[PDB]
């Protein structure tokens, strides 16, 4: 049962989590300028709303 080193896979779980998160986050870099402007406006809305909530 232990010949496949289960604790090694348990600590390799963060590696596959990082790989999956990077692959998911790379979908935002679609290369479209209109999406880049939309993301800038989204960040502006998020920053302004966070500043108004925490004030």
């Amino acid at each position: 049962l232990l010949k496949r080193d289960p604790l090694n896979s348990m600590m390799n779980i963060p590696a596959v989590l990082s790989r999956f998160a990077g692959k998911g986050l790379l979908l935002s870099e679609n290369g479209y300028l209109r999406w880049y402007v939309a993301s800038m406006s989204i960040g502006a809305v998020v920053v302004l709303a966070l500043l108004m909530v925490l004030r």
Binding site: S18, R19, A21, G22, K23, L25, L26, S28, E29, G31, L33, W35, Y36, V37, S39, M40, I42, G43, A44, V46, V47, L48, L50, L51, M52, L54, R55
Partner: protein, 470 residues
């Protein structure tokens, strides 16, 4: 406030670079000579770098209702000037293969260096805006210098549209800030508030729009999506300049703005910048895991390093060595990015695969692996000294989430930086003194990284000498 001769001698790098712009422009008007115009630009930038000595002996004073000169301004002016000099040195062998006019490149580099010096010396919203635009617009020209190429034109269009949007965002932000306060000086941004009422909504919204513009300009999440495309599509000396000089000047003016303003110690602004820095570190490190292109990888690296910079930014009002940490980190990051993008430029020159680089270009492979160890914060490198400074500043102010983000992003950066540095030595299937000069530039950059990673005390003393006014 009027201008005195002492104020003129405080204006020395700005005046020298402007005179260099005029002289190079008139020399281009006389006769298109690539070598002589490049020599004039390098001579002017080196003259400003030398005249920083006279600026230092002039003392720290206020020249304008806009500008303030101190050791902080000298340090950032020197960083911007060194980045511009390296950009010209890398650009000459690349421009040897350009069929169209090559002489406008150095004019644009000089104007962008002028904007960087203004941003270093900026103590006003007008000077901040004009320095940002004076950096941005020559970079619009330089990114799309090879406009016949698909990638360069695409990157130029993206950078121009997005930076115009960020400029409008920033300008509306200072418009709201000036509507609240009534003075555009850095020291008066919130000075008319007391009794714990610093968090006025209009001032906070104006600073938030300013954060939107500057976080575009600093490749901070979520205004970071332009960085890999603009870094890849632009010419490699332009990528070098955009990685080093623009980021350093804009972060220096953000440092000065958040030190001097009374609103800079607001809790909501601190939490928003903590979120931005955390997301910037994590996203920039995660998105560079599977990049086979060196330029996009270094763009995501720039995002991560600016996240570490913002972590050092947040503890400005609490800690005491936050500016010293920022200066040490920025010197190390300038050296590392200059070396890495310079080897990329020398492999992309002249204008017409990093695997197996050691078997035909061993010196450049060694310089590249030194800088990719440096950007990973490996000891015996100056990037490690910068990361140690960032971690010490984070530990002092009890920014534990930021410290954990730095550690995790450092592990992910270690993965991809070592992947490239060991792909250098695998197996895969010039002849002018300017190319040798670029090789000498990247070699001295690597030697400086190694020496100041083993012996960081002179750089620490130099940065501690560059103390701004209290």
């Amino acid at each position: 406030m009027t201008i005195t001769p002492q104020n003129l001698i405080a204006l020395l790098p700005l005046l020298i670079v402007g005179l260099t712009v005029v002289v190079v422009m008139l020399s281009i008007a006389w006769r298109r000579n690539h070598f002589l115009n490049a020599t004039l630009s390098v001579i002017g930038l080196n003259a400003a770098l030398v005249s920083l000595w006279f600026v230092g002996q002039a003392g720290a004073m206020d020249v304008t209702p806009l500008m303030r000169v101190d050791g902080f301004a000298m340090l950032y002016t020197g960083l911007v000037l060194l980045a511009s000099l390296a950009t010209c040195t890398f650009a000459y062998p690349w421009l040897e293969g350009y069929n169209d006019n090559k002489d406008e490149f150095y004019l644009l580099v000089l104007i962008a260096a002028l904007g960087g010096i203004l941003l270093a010396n900026a103590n006003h919203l007008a000077s901040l805006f004009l320095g940002i635009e004076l950096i941005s617009l020559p970079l619009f020209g330089l990114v799309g210098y090879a406009f016949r190429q698909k990638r360069s034109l695409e990157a130029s269009i993206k950078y121009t549209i997005l930076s115009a949007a960020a400029s409008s965002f920033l300008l509306f932000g200072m418009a709201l800030v000036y509507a609240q306060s009534g003075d555009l000086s850095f020291v008066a941004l919130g000075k008319n508030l007391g009794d714990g009422m610093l968090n006025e909504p209009l001032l906070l919204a104006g600073f938030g729009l300013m954060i939107v513009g500057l976080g575009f300009k600093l490749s901070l999440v979520p205004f970071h999506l332009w960085t890999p495309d603009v870094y890849q599509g632009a010419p490699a000396p332009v990528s070098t300049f955009l990685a080093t000089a623009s980021k350093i000047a804009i972060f220096g003016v953000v440092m000065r703005l958040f030190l001097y303003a009374p609103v800079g110690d607001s809790e909501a602004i601190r939490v928003v910048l903590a979120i931005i820095a955390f997301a910037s570190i994590i996203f920039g490190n995660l998105m560079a895991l599977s990049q086979t292109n060196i330029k996009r990888l270094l763009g995501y690296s720039s995002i991560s390093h600016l996240g570490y910079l913002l972590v050092a930014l947040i503890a400005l009002q609490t800690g005491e060595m936050s500016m010293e940490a920022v200066g040490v980190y920025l010197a190390g990051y300038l050296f590392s990015s200059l070396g890495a993008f310079g080897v990329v430029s020398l492999m992309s020159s002249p204008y017409r695969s990093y695997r197996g680089l050691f078997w035909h270009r061993p010196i450049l492979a060694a310089v590249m692996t030194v800088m990719m160890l440096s950007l990973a914060g490996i000891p015996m490198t100056l990037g490690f000294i910068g990361k140690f400074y960032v971690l010490a500043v984070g530990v002092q102010a009890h920014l534990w989430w930021l410290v954990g983000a730095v550690v995790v992003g450092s592990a992910i950066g270690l993965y991809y930086y070592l992947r490239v540095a060991v792909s250098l030595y695998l197996h895969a299937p010039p002849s002018n003194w300017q190319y040798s000069a670029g090789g000498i530039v990247v070699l001295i950059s690597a030697l400086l990284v190694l020496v100041l990673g083993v012996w960081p005390q002179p750089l620490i003393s130099i940065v501690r000498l560059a103390m701004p006014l209290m």
